[PDB]
């Protein structure tokens, strides 16, 4: 069995590298922004024996700014470097945002009569939709167990992008879209709330001032899903949550009381979000109630008939 596994493992690693190399070669040959003279040179060195991950990264993936394949390379190489990983995530998000904005612009010109730039093939997804498509494609290929998904660093970055680029209600997007994304991808509920707590305590920009209203809304949505999950898992077994989650919702209520007060005394006139915040207060209290009941004994009596 040992000799079998060692060969199955060598073939699995070399197959992972080979697919990366094939994805690169195909993309480079098809890229409009690559001169023909270079493409023939790329085809010579990549359509043959499998190359090392260093070369694939330095000589090709990094030169062409294929940041998604850079991340797959950091995964195949067991690359321990959080800072470079996050730099690559930041470049991939920004590159995709600019590409989505460009395609929506070209569209708006068609729907208005103008002419596109020469050699531009004529309702493309909003930028936050194309961005999260890129995150999904990588996650399914790396399985979320990778070091290219440090949720403690990657979730705040994605939330930062949503704020600093208005990927919120103004354009008709769900303001909780970053949370939906990582939950559906299979991030455990406890880890989400744990990170969101750290976002709220440290107050790193842009998560500052009255925009912590949005952080509280993410916490509300995450805890809500967590509660639903626990209730579902209890019914499941008929046929972890600590007091820290309750404390976190209390502080969240205090943040909302602070934001509303500051909003009422702003220069130029009171803030327009008065009832929007009052609603969030009710939701947060409802969640603290549910969490308090579960913590207080209703969680050990979930498999029992009522």
């Amino acid at each position: 069995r040992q000799q079998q596994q060692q060969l199955n493992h060598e073939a699995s690693e070399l197959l992972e590298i080979a697919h990366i190399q094939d994805d690169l070669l195909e993309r480079l040959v098809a890229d409009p922004r690559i001169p023909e003279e270079r493409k023939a040179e790329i085809e010579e060195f990549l359509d043959g024996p499998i190359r090392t991950l260093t070369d694939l990264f330095n000589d090709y993936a990094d030169q062409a700014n294929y940041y998604d394949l850079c991340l797959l390379i950091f995964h195949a190489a067991d690359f321990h470097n959080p800072r470079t990983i996050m730099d690559t995530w930041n470049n991939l998000i920004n590159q995709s945002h600019f590409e989505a904005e460009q395609r929506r612009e070209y569209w708006e010109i068609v729907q208005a009569g103008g002419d596109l730039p020469a050699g531009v093939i004529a309702e493309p997804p909003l930028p936050y939709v194309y961005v999260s498509q890129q995150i999904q494609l990588i996650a399914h290929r790396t399985s979320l167990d990778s070091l290219i998904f440090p949720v403690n660093s990657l979730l705040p970055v994605v939330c930062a992008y949503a704020i600093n680029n208005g990927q919120d209600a103004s354009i008709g997007a769900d303001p909780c879209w970053p949370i939906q994304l990582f939950l559906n991808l299979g991030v455990p509920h406890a880890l989400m709330v744990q990170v969101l707590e750290n976002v709220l305590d440290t107050q790193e920009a842009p998560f500052t001032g009255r925009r912590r209203k949005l952080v509280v809304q993410w916490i509300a949505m995450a805890v809500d899903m967590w509660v639903r999950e626990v209730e579902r898992r209890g019914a499941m077994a008929a046929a972890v949550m600590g007091s820290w989650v309750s404390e976190l919702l209390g502080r969240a209520d205090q943040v909302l009381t602070q934001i509303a007060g500051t909003g009422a005394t702003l220069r130029g006139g009171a803030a327009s979000d008065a009832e929007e915040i009052a609603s969030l207060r009710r939701t947060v209290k409802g969640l603290k109630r549910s969490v308090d009941m579960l913590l207080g004994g209703e969680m050990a009596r979930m498999s029992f008939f009522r």
Partner: peptide
């Protein structure tokens, strides 16, 4: 085994020779 070396590469956007 990966080793990044931004120093000396080959200009991916220039022909050879």
């Amino acid at each position: 085994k990966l080793v990044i070396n931004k120093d000396m590469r080959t200009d991916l956007f220039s022909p050879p020779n």
